[PDB]
From Swiss-Prot, chains A, B:
GO terms for molecular function: ATP binding; ATP hydrolysis activity; ATP-dependent protein folding chaperone; CTP binding; dATP binding; disordered domain specific binding; DNA polymerase binding; enzyme-substrate adaptor activity. GO terms for cellular component: apical plasma membrane; axonal growth cone; basolateral plasma membrane; brush border membrane; cell surface; cytoplasm; cytosol; dendritic growth cone. This is Heat shock protein HSP 90-alpha. Its main location: nucleus. Keywords: Acetylation, ATP-binding, Cell membrane, Chaperone, Cytoplasm, Host-virus interaction, Hydrolase, Membrane, Mitochondrion, Nucleotide-binding, Nucleus, Phosphoprotein, S-nitrosylation, Stress response, Ubl conjugation. The chain holds residues 17 to 223 of 732 of the full protein. It is found in: Nucleus; Cytoplasm; Melanosome; Cell membrane. Residues 1-207 are annotated as: Interaction with NR3C1. The modification N6-acetyllysine is found at residues 42, 68. It comes from Homo sapiens (Human). ATP binds at residues 35, 77, 96, 122.
Amino acid sequence: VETFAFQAEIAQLMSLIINTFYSNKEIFLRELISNSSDALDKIRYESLTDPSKLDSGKELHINLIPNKQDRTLTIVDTGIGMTKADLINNLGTIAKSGTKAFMEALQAGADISMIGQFGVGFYSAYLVAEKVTVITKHNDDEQYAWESSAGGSFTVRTDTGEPMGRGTKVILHLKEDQTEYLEERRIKEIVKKHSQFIGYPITLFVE
Amino acid sequence: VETFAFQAEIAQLMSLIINTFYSNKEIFLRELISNSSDALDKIRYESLTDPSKLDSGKELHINLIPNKQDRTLTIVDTGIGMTKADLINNLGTIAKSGTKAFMEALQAGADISMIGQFGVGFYSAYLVAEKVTVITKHNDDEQYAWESSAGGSFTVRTDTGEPMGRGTKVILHLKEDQTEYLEERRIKEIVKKHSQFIGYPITLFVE
Ligand SMILES: Cc1cc(CNS(=O)(=O)c2cccc(N/C=C3\CCOC3=O)c2)nc(N)n1
Ligand SMILES: Cc1cc(CNS(=O)(=O)c2cccc(N/C=C3\CCOC3=O)c2)nc(N)n1
């Protein structure tokens, strides 16, 4: 188990998300489904020239899994996934994101719902989650589990409990007052409202 | 000069953009600036682990150049740029884009302004330009000029007259009735409305 400190600006962004009273929090689903869709476009494209890239699963889709017993909402995709390096870079540092631009925009009156246009929509998960676990498997690496309850640090460790072929699973450990996002009606309404045009199947699992 | 045929779907997409009646054409500027911004994020990020990546130019910015004499509007950035292969593949085919989903979205009520969400915002240039020329220089290749007036084909040839160091320049050869986008007041208005939060300087050249 390795522990890392988020780059300062990312930590700052995360605190802002957790401490703000933004009302339209439902957009966290749109942002994660968007990320999944983009990850799916990637593997789809690479497979165009390297058919073997799909030996780890040819099906390209997105699964939404609510569990009221564990109070978690999980977003799963069979996209390109992330290597260990990808996890530490894409999720722990500004990297290619517009973190700085986004934080400055918020000070200038920008809206939180625009978070996705700055390449940091993942973090909106903290609008409704106290902790986020990310399990991912990329064709070029082994399976890994990333995790953070904010506070400035995150952990990464190899995940061997149950192989997933290829993709990313974002597990949202919901805040006590955000359980509405586990209700079928609520989830369906959100998907129809913000992700109706996604070019991949989105299946809502029944509990 | 090499002449290529667009992938069928891409030709179909450009056709939908050129023939559909849609008055809110101003979004083309937001889409091009967004591409420039993302291309800057990419070189900014790569330069983190490899400072030499900026030997071809450390300044990261976007320039908007109007010319009423040549009836052109040029969007230039000092982003990562595109290799020859990148031009042919990224502008000539679906690649990792959401071309398929966008065309389906349009037939399902989606709006053309939503084009950028599907990774094909570049083609919105055709909302106002009869011809588009793309001059680009990537660190790992020579300078090339891509060009198309739609019609199902595009050309690529080496460019030399004037080296740019690194980046991309999108030259919009405007349609006779779209000269408003050459007016300083019009451009300033569009930038404030759709690109006020970009994290890179956007300089509007004076005529
Ligand atoms: C984060 C992430 C990464 C990937 C696979 N990698 S990708 O290159 O295809 C990919 C696909 C879509 C988004 C990202 N990066 C997003 C970020 C970075 C920080 O905050 C964000 O929102 C990466 N899939 C999924 N579902 N989520
Ligand atoms: C198209 C393009 C590409 C790049 C440099 N490459 S990038 O990987 O950093 C890059 C940055 C932003 C967007 C893209 N691809 C966009 C596309 C493809 C089909 O239609 C679109 O809209 C590529 N810079 C600029 N200014 N424009």
